[PDB]
Design a binder for this molecule. Sequence first.
Ligand SMILES: [Ca+2]
Length: 129
Amino acid sequence: KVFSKCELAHKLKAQEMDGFGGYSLANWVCMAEYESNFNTRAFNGKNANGSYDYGLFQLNSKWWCKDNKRSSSNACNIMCSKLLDDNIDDDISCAKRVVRDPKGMSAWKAWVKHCKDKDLSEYLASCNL
Ligand SMILES: [Ca+2]
């Protein structure tokens, strides 16, 4: 599934992401745009580390989810394939676990590169009155 920006914003809002970990809904949506281009089937086989990144939030196979091709801490207690389907509730629950760790949203390198310290005041302007 490929979300529209505003579709994703409203989904994330409904799952209590606005201000989650201190980060605005715009920040959460921005991370998704630059990590996966809003595509739930996004997949990066060789990360800079060596691990693989899965789904809308590009969750890695070393710390967060498990596939059976490398060792994983599997901190989200989830098969990596479940981050490639259309429904993102489990992706969201995992991203909530990820942000509470010491880097916060800087865990996501594409968020750091494209969204961090940027003015997102108009980023979700089309999604609300
Ligand atoms: Ca999923």
